[PDB]
Amino acid sequence: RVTDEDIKERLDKIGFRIAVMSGKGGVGKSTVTALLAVHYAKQGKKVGILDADFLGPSIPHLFGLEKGKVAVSDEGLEPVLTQRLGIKVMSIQFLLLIAGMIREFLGRVAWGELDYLLIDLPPGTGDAPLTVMQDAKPNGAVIVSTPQELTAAVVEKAITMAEQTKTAVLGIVENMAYFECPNCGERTYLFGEGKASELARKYKIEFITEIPIDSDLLKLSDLGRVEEYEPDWFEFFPYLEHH
Amino acid sequence: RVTDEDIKERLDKIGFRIAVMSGKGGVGKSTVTALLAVHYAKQGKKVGILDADFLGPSIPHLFGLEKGKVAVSDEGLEPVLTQRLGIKVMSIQFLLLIAGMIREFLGRVAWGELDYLLIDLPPGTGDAPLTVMQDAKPNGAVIVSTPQELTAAVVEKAITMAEQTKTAVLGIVENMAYFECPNCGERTYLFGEGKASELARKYKIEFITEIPIDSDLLKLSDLGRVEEYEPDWFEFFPYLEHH
Ligand SMILES: Nc1ncnc2c1ncn2[C@@H]1O[C@H](COP(=O)(O)OP(=O)(O)O)[C@@H](O)[C@H]1O
Ligand SMILES: Nc1ncnc2c1ncn2[C@@H]1O[C@H](COP(=O)(O)OP(=O)(O)O)[C@@H](O)[C@H]1O
Ligand SMILES: [Co+2]
């Protein structure tokens, strides 16, 4: 029930729209989304997360936000804040086709003035996650994949999808690429690891990052204490003009 | 088209029907299925795998069977053999509602005389993987799960499912439970690990196994050379009267 000119007034308050996308489920798209939100918050930035992943909404759980409950104000649907860093979150989860659902999330929600809105897309390169790009029209987008995914095929379906809304492909994230023994700091690289950097060099993408399988990230993910995860795999995420 | 009394003549040639099942996707159900097939073959046994996982058929890939071509004989639909150990495989994959598809797989396929038929179910505890239990009515079934999401809930939906066809729950497999540094042989246990043994003791299941995250299993899985995977996580899988 929200006009195309209506969202404009809302997104005008938002410095930069990043979308996070994946070849498929279980590659840690929502976890990365969360870690980028945490990166930005901790740098002093005001951050919003829109959970577009109706399939399996990981986002609220990661911030221990099962206390769903949206409330309505002058400004509209008040997003629930993460207690440690004040990140604003919106998820279907907070109500116990979607073409228009995203239009509401961009319309009726009081995002206020924030520097970055992170959209946790549905998984894959299908129509589902393209419908969301239709309405969110992001400035930037970030590919999340495991080594043993991460083909030029996938990366090209990704660059092509980003064409349909004119969005820059800012980075590849190689999630669960290696493991670092905490005893002896030995790394063991999972088969297919190192492809992110080669494909990035290949298609002229400027940001690569290889996130290991981290027991602590799994612990705190589960506990919903992700805001306390110390390691920043986005230490070197490039600046992005966000006025 | 295959009659209910028709399958009887076929399964009469088959010593024991094991079904492999999961709380959800990406927990390595198909990989375990494959490793149990390999365990049995290498022990001298004649083994069949029915790939009931139409969703995302991992099985043929694991044995490098993209040569997906069935042929028909007197005996019927000839399963394609794995080249190293002679395991017989059947998968929709070999043709480039399913209620009756499984009925064909159990009916029209020439399984011949074999000791074990392993059924790689669809993932989860939903209707999909229950339809297959209807027609396969397995003697035994094995739960595959990762630590994070190995709940009494899941295990009970599993024991309950197995009731509906009177099948024994033979084992729990905790897949990707830990990692062993190849430098210093240190193990690092993923959060939630050790639950399989507690739940098994709890619901009186006789077989537990914890499979680590294995770079080599990932390598050979991908290469489709799984038959050459040396480690047997079923070293101590109990005997099962299979006349
Ligand atoms: N680097 C990592 N180390 C350990 N666990 C991880 C890592 N990345 C993701 N996970 C876990 O893997 C699972 C899948 O991540 P998730 O974000 O749900 O993927 P997706 O967004 O594709 O569904 C979750 O349990 C998540 O916390
Ligand atoms: N213990 C393990 N170590 C490393 N990789 C594994 C392990 N178990 C499974 N995998 C890999 O994880 C992925 C998921 O396994 P799969 O059997 O396809 O899950 P499911 O059958 O439940 O969909 C595959 O790439 C598989 O080879
Ligand atoms: Co070590």
Side-chain angles (χ1 to χ4, degrees), chain A residues 148 179 181-184 186 188-191 213 215 218-219 222-223, chain B residues 148 179 181-184 186 188-191 213 215 218-219 222-223:
Chain A
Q148 77 137 175
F179 185 110
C181 173
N183 168 66
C184 72
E186 167 73 330
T188 301
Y189 304 86
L190 271 52
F191 176 96
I213 296 159
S215 58
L218 188 41
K219 177 176 81 174
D222 295 14
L223 275 73
Chain B
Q148 75 136 174
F179 189 38
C181 172
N183 169 66
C184 72
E186 168 72 329
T188 301
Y189 301 96
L190 270 56
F191 174 95
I213 295 156
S215 57
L218 190 39
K219 179 165 82 194
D222 295 14
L223 298 177

PDB file of all heavy atoms in Angstrom, chain A residues 148 179 181-184 186 188-191 213 215 218-219 222-223, chain B residues 148 179 181-184 186 188-191 213 215 218-219 222-223:
ATOM      1  N   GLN A 148      34.116 -24.273  -2.063  1.00  0.00           N
ATOM      2  CA  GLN A 148      33.623 -25.361  -2.929  1.00  0.00           C
ATOM      3  C   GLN A 148      32.314 -24.953  -3.627  1.00  0.00           C
ATOM      4  O   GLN A 148      31.753 -25.824  -4.312  1.00  0.00           O
ATOM      5  CB  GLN A 148      33.518 -26.642  -2.101  1.00  0.00           C
ATOM      6  CG  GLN A 148      32.303 -26.709  -1.190  1.00  0.00           C
ATOM      7  CD  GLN A 148      31.659 -28.075  -1.222  1.00  0.00           C
ATOM      8  OE1 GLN A 148      30.717 -28.346  -0.481  1.00  0.00           O
ATOM      9  NE2 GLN A 148      32.163 -28.956  -2.077  1.00  0.00           N
ATOM     10  N   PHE A 179      40.798 -23.307   8.395  1.00  0.00           N
ATOM     11  CA  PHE A 179      40.733 -23.464   9.863  1.00  0.00           C
ATOM     12  C   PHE A 179      42.120 -23.160  10.435  1.00  0.00           C
ATOM     13  O   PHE A 179      43.113 -23.584   9.815  1.00  0.00           O
ATOM     14  CB  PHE A 179      40.226 -24.878  10.158  1.00  0.00           C
ATOM     15  CG  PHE A 179      39.970 -25.187  11.610  1.00  0.00           C
ATOM     16  CD1 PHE A 179      38.676 -25.358  12.088  1.00  0.00           C
ATOM     17  CD2 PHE A 179      41.028 -25.374  12.490  1.00  0.00           C
ATOM     18  CE1 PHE A 179      38.446 -25.671  13.419  1.00  0.00           C
ATOM     19  CE2 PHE A 179      40.796 -25.677  13.823  1.00  0.00           C
ATOM     20  CZ  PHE A 179      39.505 -25.828  14.280  1.00  0.00           C
ATOM     21  N   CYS A 181      44.205 -23.862  13.783  1.00  0.00           N
ATOM     22  CA  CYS A 181      44.441 -24.598  15.049  1.00  0.00           C
ATOM     23  C   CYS A 181      44.802 -23.591  16.144  1.00  0.00           C
ATOM     24  O   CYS A 181      45.741 -22.814  15.992  1.00  0.00           O
ATOM     25  CB  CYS A 181      45.543 -25.630  14.840  1.00  0.00           C
ATOM     26  SG  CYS A 181      46.080 -26.453  16.359  1.00  0.00           S
ATOM     27  N   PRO A 182      44.036 -23.532  17.261  1.00  0.00           N
ATOM     28  CA  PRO A 182      44.307 -22.579  18.338  1.00  0.00           C
ATOM     29  C   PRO A 182      45.513 -22.998  19.186  1.00  0.00           C
ATOM     30  O   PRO A 182      46.044 -22.197  19.902  1.00  0.00           O
ATOM     31  CB  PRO A 182      43.017 -22.632  19.158  1.00  0.00           C
ATOM     32  CG  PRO A 182      42.567 -24.059  19.003  1.00  0.00           C
ATOM     33  CD  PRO A 182      42.878 -24.391  17.558  1.00  0.00           C
ATOM     34  N   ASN A 183      45.896 -24.263  19.086  1.00  0.00           N
ATOM     35  CA  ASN A 183      47.076 -24.831  19.778  1.00  0.00           C
ATOM     36  C   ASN A 183      48.348 -24.262  19.141  1.00  0.00           C
ATOM     37  O   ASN A 183      49.146 -23.678  19.882  1.00  0.00           O
ATOM     38  CB  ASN A 183      47.029 -26.360  19.743  1.00  0.00           C
ATOM     39  CG  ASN A 183      48.320 -27.013  20.179  1.00  0.00           C
ATOM     40  OD1 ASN A 183      48.706 -26.901  21.340  1.00  0.00           O
ATOM     41  ND2 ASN A 183      48.978 -27.701  19.259  1.00  0.00           N
ATOM     42  N   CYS A 184      48.519 -24.419  17.826  1.00  0.00           N
ATOM     43  CA  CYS A 184      49.799 -24.173  17.102  1.00  0.00           C
ATOM     44  C   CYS A 184      49.639 -23.162  15.960  1.00  0.00           C
ATOM     45  O   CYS A 184      50.595 -23.021  15.186  1.00  0.00           O
ATOM     46  CB  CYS A 184      50.330 -25.472  16.512  1.00  0.00           C
ATOM     47  SG  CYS A 184      49.371 -26.071  15.095  1.00  0.00           S
ATOM     48  N   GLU A 186      48.483 -23.338  13.156  1.00  0.00           N
ATOM     49  CA  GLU A 186      48.513 -23.952  11.804  1.00  0.00           C
ATOM     50  C   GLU A 186      47.193 -23.635  11.088  1.00  0.00           C
ATOM     51  O   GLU A 186      46.124 -23.689  11.751  1.00  0.00           O
ATOM     52  CB  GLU A 186      48.711 -25.466  11.918  1.00  0.00           C
ATOM     53  CG  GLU A 186      48.455 -26.225  10.628  1.00  0.00           C
ATOM     54  CD  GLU A 186      49.538 -26.047   9.580  1.00  0.00           C
ATOM     55  OE1 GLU A 186      50.171 -24.967   9.552  1.00  0.00           O
ATOM     56  OE2 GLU A 186      49.752 -26.999   8.805  1.00  0.00           O
ATOM     57  N   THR A 188      44.741 -24.905   7.860  1.00  0.00           N
ATOM     58  CA  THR A 188      44.426 -25.991   6.919  1.00  0.00           C
ATOM     59  C   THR A 188      43.340 -25.423   6.025  1.00  0.00           C
ATOM     60  O   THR A 188      42.307 -25.003   6.581  1.00  0.00           O
ATOM     61  CB  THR A 188      43.997 -27.251   7.676  1.00  0.00           C
ATOM     62  OG1 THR A 188      45.075 -27.640   8.542  1.00  0.00           O
ATOM     63  CG2 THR A 188      43.588 -28.366   6.742  1.00  0.00           C
ATOM     64  N   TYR A 189      43.612 -25.343   4.726  1.00  0.00           N
ATOM     65  CA  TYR A 189      42.762 -24.648   3.730  1.00  0.00           C
ATOM     66  C   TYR A 189      41.827 -25.679   3.105  1.00  0.00           C
ATOM     67  O   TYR A 189      42.311 -26.687   2.582  1.00  0.00           O
ATOM     68  CB  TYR A 189      43.625 -23.909   2.700  1.00  0.00           C
ATOM     69  CG  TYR A 189      44.587 -22.926   3.317  1.00  0.00           C
ATOM     70  CD1 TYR A 189      45.837 -23.340   3.750  1.00  0.00           C
ATOM     71  CD2 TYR A 189      44.236 -21.594   3.506  1.00  0.00           C
ATOM     72  CE1 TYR A 189      46.721 -22.461   4.354  1.00  0.00           C
ATOM     73  CE2 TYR A 189      45.109 -20.700   4.107  1.00  0.00           C
ATOM     74  CZ  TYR A 189      46.356 -21.135   4.538  1.00  0.00           C
ATOM     75  OH  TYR A 189      47.228 -20.264   5.134  1.00  0.00           O
ATOM     76  N   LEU A 190      40.522 -25.431   3.167  1.00  0.00           N
ATOM     77  CA  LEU A 190      39.524 -26.343   2.559  1.00  0.00           C
ATOM     78  C   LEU A 190      39.672 -26.263   1.043  1.00  0.00           C
ATOM     79  O   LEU A 190      39.913 -25.170   0.539  1.00  0.00           O
ATOM     80  CB  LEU A 190      38.110 -25.972   3.014  1.00  0.00           C
ATOM     81  CG  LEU A 190      37.612 -26.630   4.309  1.00  0.00           C
ATOM     82  CD1 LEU A 190      38.600 -26.459   5.464  1.00  0.00           C
ATOM     83  CD2 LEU A 190      36.244 -26.072   4.693  1.00  0.00           C
ATOM     84  N   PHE A 191      39.549 -27.405   0.372  1.00  0.00           N
ATOM     85  CA  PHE A 191      39.617 -27.578  -1.103  1.00  0.00           C
ATOM     86  C   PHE A 191      38.760 -26.518  -1.808  1.00  0.00           C
ATOM     87  O   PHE A 191      37.538 -26.370  -1.483  1.00  0.00           O
ATOM     88  CB  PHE A 191      39.163 -28.995  -1.461  1.00  0.00           C
ATOM     89  CG  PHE A 191      39.067 -29.322  -2.932  1.00  0.00           C
ATOM     90  CD1 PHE A 191      40.118 -29.954  -3.585  1.00  0.00           C
ATOM     91  CD2 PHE A 191      37.901 -29.062  -3.641  1.00  0.00           C
ATOM     92  CE1 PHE A 191      40.019 -30.295  -4.922  1.00  0.00           C
ATOM     93  CE2 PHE A 191      37.805 -29.401  -4.983  1.00  0.00           C
ATOM     94  CZ  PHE A 191      38.862 -30.020  -5.618  1.00  0.00           C
ATOM     95  N   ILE A 213      36.469 -21.078   9.248  1.00  0.00           N
ATOM     96  CA  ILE A 213      35.502 -21.767  10.156  1.00  0.00           C
ATOM     97  C   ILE A 213      35.943 -21.435  11.577  1.00  0.00           C
ATOM     98  O   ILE A 213      37.052 -21.859  11.957  1.00  0.00           O
ATOM     99  CB  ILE A 213      35.465 -23.291   9.935  1.00  0.00           C
ATOM    100  CG1 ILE A 213      34.959 -23.669   8.541  1.00  0.00           C
ATOM    101  CG2 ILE A 213      34.644 -23.956  11.036  1.00  0.00           C
ATOM    102  CD1 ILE A 213      35.379 -25.054   8.102  1.00  0.00           C
ATOM    103  N   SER A 215      34.964 -21.563  15.520  1.00  0.00           N
ATOM    104  CA  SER A 215      34.204 -22.147  16.656  1.00  0.00           C
ATOM    105  C   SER A 215      33.516 -21.026  17.450  1.00  0.00           C
ATOM    106  O   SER A 215      32.326 -21.181  17.768  1.00  0.00           O
ATOM    107  CB  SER A 215      35.114 -22.971  17.529  1.00  0.00           C
ATOM    108  OG  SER A 215      36.200 -22.193  18.016  1.00  0.00           O
ATOM    109  N   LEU A 218      30.589 -19.457  15.753  1.00  0.00           N
ATOM    110  CA  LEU A 218      29.465 -20.432  15.823  1.00  0.00           C
ATOM    111  C   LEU A 218      28.812 -20.344  17.212  1.00  0.00           C
ATOM    112  O   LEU A 218      27.563 -20.246  17.294  1.00  0.00           O
ATOM    113  CB  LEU A 218      30.019 -21.832  15.532  1.00  0.00           C
ATOM    114  CG  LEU A 218      28.989 -22.947  15.367  1.00  0.00           C
ATOM    115  CD1 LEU A 218      27.788 -22.471  14.567  1.00  0.00           C
ATOM    116  CD2 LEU A 218      29.618 -24.166  14.716  1.00  0.00           C
ATOM    117  N   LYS A 219      29.636 -20.341  18.262  1.00  0.00           N
ATOM    118  CA  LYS A 219      29.202 -20.196  19.677  1.00  0.00           C
ATOM    119  C   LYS A 219      28.280 -18.978  19.768  1.00  0.00           C
ATOM    120  O   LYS A 219      27.067 -19.153  20.065  1.00  0.00           O
ATOM    121  CB  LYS A 219      30.425 -20.061  20.590  1.00  0.00           C
ATOM    122  CG  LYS A 219      30.117 -19.839  22.066  1.00  0.00           C
ATOM    123  CD  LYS A 219      31.353 -19.806  22.966  1.00  0.00           C
ATOM    124  CE  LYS A 219      32.064 -18.467  22.964  1.00  0.00           C
ATOM    125  NZ  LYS A 219      33.174 -18.433  23.944  1.00  0.00           N
ATOM    126  N   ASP A 222      25.000 -18.705  17.784  1.00  0.00           N
ATOM    127  CA  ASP A 222      23.971 -19.551  18.425  1.00  0.00           C
ATOM    128  C   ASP A 222      23.431 -18.812  19.648  1.00  0.00           C
ATOM    129  O   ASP A 222      22.222 -18.555  19.676  1.00  0.00           O
ATOM    130  CB  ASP A 222      24.563 -20.919  18.735  1.00  0.00           C
ATOM    131  CG  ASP A 222      24.948 -21.678  17.474  1.00  0.00           C
ATOM    132  OD1 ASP A 222      24.998 -21.037  16.389  1.00  0.00           O
ATOM    133  OD2 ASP A 222      25.178 -22.909  17.581  1.00  0.00           O
ATOM    134  N   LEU A 223      24.312 -18.401  20.562  1.00  0.00           N
ATOM    135  CA  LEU A 223      23.958 -17.648  21.795  1.00  0.00           C
ATOM    136  C   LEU A 223      23.246 -16.323  21.471  1.00  0.00           C
ATOM    137  O   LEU A 223      22.764 -15.700  22.433  1.00  0.00           O
ATOM    138  CB  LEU A 223      25.241 -17.343  22.573  1.00  0.00           C
ATOM    139  CG  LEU A 223      25.767 -18.418  23.516  1.00  0.00           C
ATOM    140  CD1 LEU A 223      26.383 -19.570  22.755  1.00  0.00           C
ATOM    141  CD2 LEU A 223      26.804 -17.815  24.449  1.00  0.00           C
TER     142      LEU A 223
ATOM    143  N   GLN B 148      25.406 -28.276  15.964  1.00  0.00           N
ATOM    144  CA  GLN B 148      24.503 -27.111  16.076  1.00  0.00           C
ATOM    145  C   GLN B 148      23.218 -27.472  15.328  1.00  0.00           C
ATOM    146  O   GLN B 148      23.231 -27.599  14.101  1.00  0.00           O
ATOM    147  CB  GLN B 148      25.211 -25.843  15.612  1.00  0.00           C
ATOM    148  CG  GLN B 148      25.371 -25.714  14.107  1.00  0.00           C
ATOM    149  CD  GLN B 148      25.042 -24.322  13.619  1.00  0.00           C
ATOM    150  OE1 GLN B 148      25.221 -24.007  12.443  1.00  0.00           O
ATOM    151  NE2 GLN B 148      24.558 -23.472  14.516  1.00  0.00           N
ATOM    152  N   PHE B 179      37.504 -30.581  14.432  1.00  0.00           N
ATOM    153  CA  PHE B 179      38.614 -30.602  13.457  1.00  0.00           C
ATOM    154  C   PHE B 179      39.885 -31.049  14.180  1.00  0.00           C
ATOM    155  O   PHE B 179      40.080 -30.655  15.330  1.00  0.00           O
ATOM    156  CB  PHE B 179      38.760 -29.241  12.774  1.00  0.00           C
ATOM    157  CG  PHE B 179      39.723 -29.236  11.609  1.00  0.00           C
ATOM    158  CD1 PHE B 179      39.812 -30.310  10.731  1.00  0.00           C
ATOM    159  CD2 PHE B 179      40.565 -28.158  11.404  1.00  0.00           C
ATOM    160  CE1 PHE B 179      40.694 -30.281   9.660  1.00  0.00           C
ATOM    161  CE2 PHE B 179      41.449 -28.129  10.336  1.00  0.00           C
ATOM    162  CZ  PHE B 179      41.514 -29.191   9.468  1.00  0.00           C
ATOM    163  N   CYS B 181      43.826 -30.694  13.660  1.00  0.00           N
ATOM    164  CA  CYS B 181      45.005 -30.030  13.052  1.00  0.00           C
ATOM    165  C   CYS B 181      45.974 -31.107  12.559  1.00  0.00           C
ATOM    166  O   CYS B 181      46.391 -31.974  13.325  1.00  0.00           O
ATOM    167  CB  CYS B 181      45.648 -29.108  14.081  1.00  0.00           C
ATOM    168  SG  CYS B 181      47.226 -28.398  13.557  1.00  0.00           S
ATOM    169  N   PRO B 182      46.324 -31.121  11.252  1.00  0.00           N
ATOM    170  CA  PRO B 182      47.231 -32.127  10.701  1.00  0.00           C
ATOM    171  C   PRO B 182      48.690 -31.868  11.096  1.00  0.00           C
ATOM    172  O   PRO B 182      49.499 -32.744  10.983  1.00  0.00           O
ATOM    173  CB  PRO B 182      47.050 -31.950   9.192  1.00  0.00           C
ATOM    174  CG  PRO B 182      46.766 -30.478   9.045  1.00  0.00           C
ATOM    175  CD  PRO B 182      45.882 -30.156  10.231  1.00  0.00           C
ATOM    176  N   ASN B 183      48.982 -30.650  11.535  1.00  0.00           N
ATOM    177  CA  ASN B 183      50.320 -30.244  12.027  1.00  0.00           C
ATOM    178  C   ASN B 183      50.587 -30.932  13.371  1.00  0.00           C
ATOM    179  O   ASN B 183      51.597 -31.630  13.466  1.00  0.00           O
ATOM    180  CB  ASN B 183      50.420 -28.719  12.117  1.00  0.00           C
ATOM    181  CG  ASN B 183      51.647 -28.235  12.856  1.00  0.00           C
ATOM    182  OD1 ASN B 183      52.766 -28.435  12.395  1.00  0.00           O
ATOM    183  ND2 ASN B 183      51.443 -27.589  13.994  1.00  0.00           N
ATOM    184  N   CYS B 184      49.707 -30.744  14.360  1.00  0.00           N
ATOM    185  CA  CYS B 184      49.944 -31.091  15.791  1.00  0.00           C
ATOM    186  C   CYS B 184      48.872 -32.034  16.350  1.00  0.00           C
ATOM    187  O   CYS B 184      48.878 -32.247  17.572  1.00  0.00           O
ATOM    188  CB  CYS B 184      49.954 -29.829  16.644  1.00  0.00           C
ATOM    189  SG  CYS B 184      48.319 -29.074  16.856  1.00  0.00           S
ATOM    190  N   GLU B 186      46.008 -31.635  17.285  1.00  0.00           N
ATOM    191  CA  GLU B 186      45.065 -30.997  18.240  1.00  0.00           C
ATOM    192  C   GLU B 186      43.644 -31.113  17.667  1.00  0.00           C
ATOM    193  O   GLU B 186      43.486 -30.952  16.432  1.00  0.00           O
ATOM    194  CB  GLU B 186      45.458 -29.538  18.469  1.00  0.00           C
ATOM    195  CG  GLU B 186      44.407 -28.726  19.195  1.00  0.00           C
ATOM    196  CD  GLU B 186      44.264 -29.050  20.671  1.00  0.00           C
ATOM    197  OE1 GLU B 186      44.488 -30.219  21.056  1.00  0.00           O
ATOM    198  OE2 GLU B 186      43.935 -28.124  21.434  1.00  0.00           O
ATOM    199  N   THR B 188      39.766 -29.393  17.886  1.00  0.00           N
ATOM    200  CA  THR B 188      38.969 -28.223  18.287  1.00  0.00           C
ATOM    201  C   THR B 188      37.535 -28.618  17.989  1.00  0.00           C
ATOM    202  O   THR B 188      37.261 -28.951  16.818  1.00  0.00           O
ATOM    203  CB  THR B 188      39.425 -26.969  17.531  1.00  0.00           C
ATOM    204  OG1 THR B 188      40.808 -26.731  17.822  1.00  0.00           O
ATOM    205  CG2 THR B 188      38.582 -25.756  17.851  1.00  0.00           C
ATOM    206  N   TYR B 189      36.699 -28.637  19.022  1.00  0.00           N
ATOM    207  CA  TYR B 189      35.322 -29.181  18.994  1.00  0.00           C
ATOM    208  C   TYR B 189      34.364 -28.032  18.690  1.00  0.00           C
ATOM    209  O   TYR B 189      34.382 -27.027  19.404  1.00  0.00           O
ATOM    210  CB  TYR B 189      35.034 -29.880  20.328  1.00  0.00           C
ATOM    211  CG  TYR B 189      35.988 -31.008  20.629  1.00  0.00           C
ATOM    212  CD1 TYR B 189      37.096 -30.798  21.438  1.00  0.00           C
ATOM    213  CD2 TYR B 189      35.818 -32.266  20.068  1.00  0.00           C
ATOM    214  CE1 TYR B 189      38.009 -31.812  21.691  1.00  0.00           C
ATOM    215  CE2 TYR B 189      36.727 -33.287  20.302  1.00  0.00           C
ATOM    216  CZ  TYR B 189      37.826 -33.061  21.119  1.00  0.00           C
ATOM    217  OH  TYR B 189      38.723 -34.067  21.360  1.00  0.00           O
ATOM    218  N   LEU B 190      33.553 -28.172  17.650  1.00  0.00           N
ATOM    219  CA  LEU B 190      32.545 -27.142  17.307  1.00  0.00           C
ATOM    220  C   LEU B 190      31.473 -27.135  18.393  1.00  0.00           C
ATOM    221  O   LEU B 190      31.129 -28.213  18.889  1.00  0.00           O
ATOM    222  CB  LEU B 190      31.950 -27.416  15.925  1.00  0.00           C
ATOM    223  CG  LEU B 190      32.683 -26.770  14.745  1.00  0.00           C
ATOM    224  CD1 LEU B 190      34.160 -27.166  14.710  1.00  0.00           C
ATOM    225  CD2 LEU B 190      31.990 -27.124  13.433  1.00  0.00           C
ATOM    226  N   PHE B 191      30.998 -25.945  18.746  1.00  0.00           N
ATOM    227  CA  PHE B 191      29.938 -25.690  19.755  1.00  0.00           C
ATOM    228  C   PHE B 191      28.734 -26.608  19.499  1.00  0.00           C
ATOM    229  O   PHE B 191      28.196 -26.641  18.351  1.00  0.00           O
ATOM    230  CB  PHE B 191      29.547 -24.209  19.722  1.00  0.00           C
ATOM    231  CG  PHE B 191      28.384 -23.799  20.595  1.00  0.00           C
ATOM    232  CD1 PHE B 191      28.596 -23.289  21.871  1.00  0.00           C
ATOM    233  CD2 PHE B 191      27.082 -23.871  20.113  1.00  0.00           C
ATOM    234  CE1 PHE B 191      27.530 -22.886  22.656  1.00  0.00           C
ATOM    235  CE2 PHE B 191      26.015 -23.465  20.902  1.00  0.00           C
ATOM    236  CZ  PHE B 191      26.242 -22.970  22.168  1.00  0.00           C
ATOM    237  N   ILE B 213      35.186 -32.387  10.458  1.00  0.00           N
ATOM    238  CA  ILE B 213      35.326 -31.637   9.173  1.00  0.00           C
ATOM    239  C   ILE B 213      36.645 -32.084   8.562  1.00  0.00           C
ATOM    240  O   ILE B 213      37.691 -31.803   9.172  1.00  0.00           O
ATOM    241  CB  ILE B 213      35.303 -30.109   9.371  1.00  0.00           C
ATOM    242  CG1 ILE B 213      33.958 -29.610   9.908  1.00  0.00           C
ATOM    243  CG2 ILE B 213      35.690 -29.404   8.076  1.00  0.00           C
ATOM    244  CD1 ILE B 213      34.051 -28.293  10.643  1.00  0.00           C
ATOM    245  N   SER B 215      39.027 -32.038   5.278  1.00  0.00           N
ATOM    246  CA  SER B 215      39.477 -31.431   4.001  1.00  0.00           C
ATOM    247  C   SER B 215      39.545 -32.513   2.912  1.00  0.00           C
ATOM    248  O   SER B 215      39.048 -32.250   1.806  1.00  0.00           O
ATOM    249  CB  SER B 215      40.801 -30.738   4.185  1.00  0.00           C
ATOM    250  OG  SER B 215      41.779 -31.645   4.679  1.00  0.00           O
ATOM    251  N   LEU B 218      36.224 -33.680   1.680  1.00  0.00           N
ATOM    252  CA  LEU B 218      35.664 -32.595   0.827  1.00  0.00           C
ATOM    253  C   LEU B 218      36.302 -32.675  -0.568  1.00  0.00           C
ATOM    254  O   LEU B 218      35.568 -32.646  -1.579  1.00  0.00           O
ATOM    255  CB  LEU B 218      35.938 -31.253   1.512  1.00  0.00           C
ATOM    256  CG  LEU B 218      35.245 -30.036   0.906  1.00  0.00           C
ATOM    257  CD1 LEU B 218      33.829 -30.361   0.448  1.00  0.00           C
ATOM    258  CD2 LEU B 218      35.233 -28.886   1.899  1.00  0.00           C
ATOM    259  N   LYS B 219      37.626 -32.810  -0.610  1.00  0.00           N
ATOM    260  CA  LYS B 219      38.424 -32.964  -1.854  1.00  0.00           C
ATOM    261  C   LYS B 219      37.797 -34.081  -2.690  1.00  0.00           C
ATOM    262  O   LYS B 219      37.277 -33.790  -3.810  1.00  0.00           O
ATOM    263  CB  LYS B 219      39.885 -33.266  -1.500  1.00  0.00           C
ATOM    264  CG  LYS B 219      40.812 -33.474  -2.687  1.00  0.00           C
ATOM    265  CD  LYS B 219      42.303 -33.426  -2.348  1.00  0.00           C
ATOM    266  CE  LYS B 219      42.835 -34.730  -1.789  1.00  0.00           C
ATOM    267  NZ  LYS B 219      44.172 -34.561  -1.174  1.00  0.00           N
ATOM    268  N   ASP B 222      34.163 -33.932  -3.937  1.00  0.00           N
ATOM    269  CA  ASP B 222      34.084 -33.016  -5.094  1.00  0.00           C
ATOM    270  C   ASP B 222      34.597 -33.753  -6.330  1.00  0.00           C
ATOM    271  O   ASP B 222      33.826 -33.888  -7.292  1.00  0.00           O
ATOM    272  CB  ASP B 222      34.837 -31.732  -4.769  1.00  0.00           C
ATOM    273  CG  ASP B 222      34.193 -30.962  -3.628  1.00  0.00           C
ATOM    274  OD1 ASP B 222      33.325 -31.552  -2.930  1.00  0.00           O
ATOM    275  OD2 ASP B 222      34.558 -29.777  -3.443  1.00  0.00           O
ATOM    276  N   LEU B 223      35.813 -34.292  -6.264  1.00  0.00           N
ATOM    277  CA  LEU B 223      36.446 -35.064  -7.370  1.00  0.00           C
ATOM    278  C   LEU B 223      35.619 -36.301  -7.760  1.00  0.00           C
ATOM    279  O   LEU B 223      35.984 -36.918  -8.776  1.00  0.00           O
ATOM    280  CB  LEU B 223      37.834 -35.512  -6.916  1.00  0.00           C
ATOM    281  CG  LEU B 223      38.804 -34.383  -6.589  1.00  0.00           C
ATOM    282  CD1 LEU B 223      40.125 -34.954  -6.088  1.00  0.00           C
ATOM    283  CD2 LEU B 223      39.012 -33.488  -7.805  1.00  0.00           C
TER     284      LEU B 223
END
